[PDB]
A paper describes a structure:
Using the fVLP preparation, we solved crystallographic and cryo-EM structures of the outer (VP1-only) MCPyV capsid. The structures have 3.5-Å and 3.4-Å resolutions, with no significant differences between them. Overall, six VP1 conformations can be distinguished within the capsid, five from a local capsomer and one from a neighboring strict capsomer, previously annotated with the Greek letters α′, α″, β, β′, γ, and α, respectively. In MCPyV, we observed clear density for five out of potentially six disulfide bridges that connect individual VP1 chains within the strict and local pentamers, respectively, i.e., for the α-α, α′-α″, α″-β, β-β′, and γ-α′ linkages. The MCPyV cryo-EM data further support the presence of this intrapentameric disulfide bond pattern; nonetheless, only the α-α connection is clearly visible in the electrostatic potential map. On the other hand, the MCPyV VP1 sequence harbors a 37-amino-acid (aa) C-terminal extension with unknown function and no detectable homology. Neither in the crystallographic electron density nor in the cryo-EM map was this extension visible. Instead, the most-C-terminal residue resolved in either map is Val388γ (from the so-called γ-chain [see below for an explanation of the chain annotation]), meaning that a stretch of 35 amino acids is completely invisible and thus most likely flexible. However, it is clear from the electron density and electron potential maps that the missing extension must be located on the exterior of the capsid.
MCPyV cell entry is unique among members of the polyomavirus family as it requires the engagement of two types of glycans, sialylated oligosaccharides and sulfated glycosaminoglycans (GAGs). On the virus side, PyV-receptor interactions are mediated entirely by the major capsid protein VP1, which forms the capsid outer layer. VP1 assembles into 72 pentameric capsomers, giving rise to small capsids of 45 to 50 nm in diameter.
Numbering used by the authors:
A (entry chain B): 20 to 53
B (entry chain A): 20 to 378
C (entry chain C), D (entry chain B): 319 to 371
Write the structure that this text describes.
Amino acid sequence: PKPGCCPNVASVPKLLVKGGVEVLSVVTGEDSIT
Amino acid sequence: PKPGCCPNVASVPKLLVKGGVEVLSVVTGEDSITQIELYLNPRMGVNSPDLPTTSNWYTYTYDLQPKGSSPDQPIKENLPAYSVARVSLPMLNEDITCDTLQMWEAISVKTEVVGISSLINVHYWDMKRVHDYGAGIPVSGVNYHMFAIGGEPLDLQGLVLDYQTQYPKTTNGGPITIETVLGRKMTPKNQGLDPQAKAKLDKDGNYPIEVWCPDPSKNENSRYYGSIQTGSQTPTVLQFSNTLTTVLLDENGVGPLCKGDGLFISCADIVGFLFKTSGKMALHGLPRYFNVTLRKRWVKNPYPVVNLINSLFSNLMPKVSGQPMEGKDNQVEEVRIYEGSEQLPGDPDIVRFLDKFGQ
Amino acid sequence: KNPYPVVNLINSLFSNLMPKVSGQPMEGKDNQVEEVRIYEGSEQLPGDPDIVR
Amino acid sequence: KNPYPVVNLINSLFSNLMPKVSGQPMEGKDNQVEEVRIYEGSEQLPGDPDIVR
């Protein structure tokens, strides 16, 4: 977990579900992107 | 005087109101216990004791015999059926600051069959004897029991013993089967179970026993206890008592919440054949007692009340047919959900299942 | 960042560790799994457990 | 922000909470309600009670 001994990457919005139609039922946070 | 001289008497929760149906209009405190009890007559093809042409065989069936010529056509009152009730529950005070409200919750249903000592009625002018100059053989054979309490009506996986049967068409209130709940011809898939045949139960004597069992898949809000003991001349057994209490509480302490303040009681107690002396046979149900002990407890409402009422006004909420975007064989391919943020994955097309790498 | 864990990945290749079966279809179009729910955390008690979204 | 007040909206929907009755016409062209006043507060005594504001 040492920052000076391990490289860092950019910040990208996290995938949470990828699938069919029946995954719109997922309870998300206050600020999501669908 | 002081409690040291007067003898101490142990406390019991006192009885406030006792009486018929119109007790339930009373307003209680925050914490109270209602102990509503009820029975129901078993609908057995012969629904009511008032038709004079068919009233002698109430809570029986007719000559329930095999036809012998393919296919069969059973009569509306030849095949047995369930029975369902609904006691009405009062309004009770809600809240709006915490979006919480009260609902009735059953905790321990008590039950007993009230017609059980009528089974030893051996003397009867049609019971088939065991031998010459004998007594008739008493009522036995096919035994079946299923009672169900719950806030929603209990639902069912419809599976018939053979798809070749032709139950009568329900122009009037008639026997609703898997033929008339979908409209197609009864395919031979329905001898095994089938997921697209899931009817609900909302009529008396119109959803037969011989076409389905209660579904164990969708009934999470209604518990049910069932049994079977079948065979031609097998002895039935039944124990009835006044000191059994079946606790209804789930793994997480919740109960069977009354959904729309309904307390659907659903039962069927078909037990035994009585042998007619000509050789005919007939199924005979017995009426079931209940004792539900509803208790008030708090809950948070599932739905927002604001967006819910907007669905009724057609100028405000439109609904079109269009092309199918839901269900089976629809035209929506991929749905993503992006929440939060993290480090960059290896590709934006991560496959999650383990096995599909060789395909 | 590495998308796939290397340890679960190598179990997928052998027929001993990841047994494949010509079984009844539980993944696909005609499959028979009816209601798969997943729980997480804790919250207040909802009104009816068959929440129609 | 919800523009429609829900308490002003939900009463208009039920037949029992808001009864609609097929009476005689009290609004429109043939209104039989003839004159309606309204009083708010109390000022000093006006010139004649036949005055109209």
